[model samples]
Target: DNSLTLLKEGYLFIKNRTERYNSDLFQARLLGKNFICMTGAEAAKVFYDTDRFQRQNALPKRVQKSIFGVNAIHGMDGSAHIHRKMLFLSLMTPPHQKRLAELMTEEWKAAVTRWEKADEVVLFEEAKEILCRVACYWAGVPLKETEVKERADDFIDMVDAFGAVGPRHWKGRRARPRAEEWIEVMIEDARAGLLKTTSGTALHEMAFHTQEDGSQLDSRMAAIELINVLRPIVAISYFLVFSALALHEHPKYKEWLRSGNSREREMFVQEVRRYYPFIPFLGALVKKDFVWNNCEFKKGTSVLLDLYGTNHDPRLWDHPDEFRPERFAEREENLFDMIPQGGGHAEKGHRCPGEGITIEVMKASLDFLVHQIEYDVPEQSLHYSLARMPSLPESGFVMSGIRRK
Candidate 1:
């Protein structure tokens, strides 16, 4: 069955089949429902069309219950989706992105002080805590020191459960209720004037955001939306570890990055996002029957876009497996081509409003790793497993002999 293969191959499920058939798309059954899995830039262009595709009921209930809290903005459609999405976009402007980056830089600086005293540090684990602090503080979500590890681990587990089952999935299922309940109280406090969230903050916006009918959002739903903003920022820890791994393996870029060219650092960040295994695919329901490339897409059909496959599609990227960062030097930005996040415009479509935040945070972290610190890469298993959904290096990029440069 297709589901079995999906469980086995994981991130490569669609890419493997497409390579075997030398085709861009294949129709199969995923858990008793007909699904058309498509790859490459062309498929992405169509999959994001609101006139042709929509997200309502597209994601599985398990996903809604775990990674994204139930009825969050991830499932909205039409004007309702745009209205909720505007709140995210308003919080992700240039100034906001810059502030997040600055906070990350400060966190890294403070973290290095402690790391220099420790025997060794796990880059991935440390990064999660730093980002959790940065995300909560930036979003106006009060995070107590005693709950930092607990909160960060839960968010990491939520993402780790995306392509998991049994135990891993259960961890995610349990984490959401604990997190939502925590955030719900904060929303209640903000609305009741007990918690002080400044105007223009995510907590303020979500707590006060009214429905089209002028009714305030329920505390539960508002908490879910707030988690949607905070969780993705923490998930950037995956890219943070990958950035460290890339530096250790591909040492040439370190000196280049130290030259202090912001553009070059951003290109490296983009390459890591494009080359790594993060979002495996995205699922959306067909809005109406349509035909493209001599194929039929029936209304309500579930279409899975092979996001990782599309990023590595040979037609779009030359030497798709290589780690070279210069490829983006002359490349023009296209919404459909590089979709580490979702494709299309963030305000108009379902693209992540946090993409700018991810890039800026990454670039700042990368600069700190290259120029502001020096460390010894301890011998460990740097190998990553594609079979693991949201795979990471076996070592989590361990660094010892840490000292500030």
Candidate 2:
């Protein structure tokens, strides 16, 4: 089968095959190309080896055009990759990301005030708007009051359509170019001194960022990178919805969540990312021929590292499907395991550099949902589908009785 199962099974496609075949590594075809589906700690170590695998052309064309954009860091390799990775690392330092976390806290606080006056608000939709505004402000971009919903919808469309093949994908495809052209003007004006932005802001750093060759990234690519920053922060809304789901489905944790112990808060955040479905798998191309577990990997062979499966693998997790936050508090993090985001060294490898920011945002949001306010999860369908890549609760998790504690 040429990965029709991939469409039907979604995040479980590889793990299902890995279990059926009883192998850590198995061959399959996706998008008409042969791919080696791999899982487990050993497989992850090999998959993340920069000497053996690179991240170029490992993504589909639809994804390139709709999600990550051409010429972005997601597709780069070697010195070109690390040099650009440094740019992300610089912007993601503690102080810069702390400012973002602080901004989101205020947004959520203000939102709760408004929610108190409304009948009900969808947490996911409200989160999209809240995070959208904070992300723009944090990145030093201007977002008008009128465009918050529109721009939020556009970003959400881009995220929603990346995994689909129909009208949703077209919506995302259209969103990217418009967003790019819009930001390109911002980049040009900033560079020409027509725009004034605070120093050390994402907009300032990215606009003036010089490559190793002593040149700025072309304006179009810069917009792509800027959206890269904006999109993922807003995407944390997925985690927020799941966190609310956690609170709704399991009341036992509420008082603890309400107490807001720093350690408990972080452990809960880690488990939400680990227990829920986020990204399905990560892709890379075989850099050079290599042998692992008696399988000879050919040069240029496309590969997928099973991110979801690794987190759920029974060998690595006890009661794998059970939503237990305590598991994280007891376990020390290994570089290859528990990768809801990509794995390996953040600076040298393809591991996402913004992971710290993801955690900070998750912690802040979870605290707000549990401690800062009171709300009731009204009658609604809260089940998230595994078949949908990047799924969310059907009702986006409704809440009435919105009020401050």
Candidate 3:
């Protein structure tokens, strides 16, 4: 079971070694394959160097089988990836992001009214249902009131299972097929002219989305592709919990947070992303033979950039362990250093295309949390375990005496 430490360590796997080895880079084995783990901004620059690394074969089978599914864009490389990426990028424009924010705001407002009548509200679970409702409607998939909570649970399961192999892993595998079929049937029906959906919605856009060589995607694959959108949007629930965690733990920021100062909110979100654990690391295969820091990277070697490690690297951040949002106050921005999201050029590189959407939704939610509502944080287990991927406060950030302002 020593081999299982990857899941056990969760986000600290790389930081643990980089300190022990006293090197920015180190070699480790998982499932009998060798991986070179690197942390820090300098390493990030090289990891995402467009000319040096390719994404093909970069992701492990466990990740592909779980969170990403078998044939999503995470595997594409070169021109194909760019073309396929444009389809997603097209929906991520300022106008689209603004609409998403509005939809989320609308959903959260409605959820709050309902929460006010309840005895207690578990934020992590509540946010998932809210995001599922918002993301589905925004994407043009009509969701029944009953479908919201159940579907949200499935998406969360798939994401949670990416690093597991036992009961947890099987549960995720079970969830994927059910979700895929739910949307797969919709995609096919829409294509066969049996279903009508709003124009420009993710459902409509993806059903008719064309690939290079002028071909529509496979029905099964198209379902996965569409879920690719919904899953991440729901996954933002993790960020939402982390955001709430910040306001509760670091009340000093409450001064700037409620006014919705764009800069402070942005920095606050960045700090929560940096200080909290998410996206433990990213994998990419060596594109060719190259040397960096006197280490040779040969072709076909799998390398992981320690995302959590780099964000907290003392070399890049002062008092890295401390929860300080102003650390980003009035500073020049560098993507490689604070990439709780992936690094490098987003549009043309492997960086997540939904970065804008994530930020907008986060800002909107942060504003609502600070200004739109007030709640009592009952004394309960707020401690989160590092060993848990997609970690959250033990009580799911429970709250009582929820009231809207």
* Number of the predicted model whose TM-score against the real structure is largest: 1
Give the alpha carbon lDDT tens digit for every residue of 213-283 in model 1: 78888999999999998889999999999999999999999988887599999999999999999989999
What are the models' TM-scores? 0.99, 0.98, 0.96
The residue ranges of model 3 lying beyond 4 angstroms of the native Cα positions read: none
Whole-model lDDT for model 1 versus the true structure?
A: 0.92
TM-score of 2: 0.98
Order by TM-score, highest first: 1, 2, 3
Q: Which is the leading candidate under lDDT?
A: 1
Candidate 3 lDDT over 78-111, as tens digits, reads 8888888888887778888899999888888887
The residue pairs found clashing in candidate 1 are none
Between candidates 2 and 3, the one scoring higher on lDDT is 2
Task: Report the Cα lDDT for candidate 3.
Answer: 0.86
TM-score of 3: 0.96
What lDDT score goes with residue 53 in model 3? 88
lDDT of each: 0.92, 0.86, 0.86
Instruction: Please provide, for model 2 over 110-222, each residue's C-alpha lDDT reduced to its tens digit, 9 standing for 90 to 100.
Output: 88668889959998999999899998888889889999988888888888887787898999899888888877898889999998877878888788888889999998888
- Root-mean-square deviation of Cα positions for candidate 2 versus the true structure, in angstroms: 1.1
Reference-based lDDT, residue 285, model 1: 94
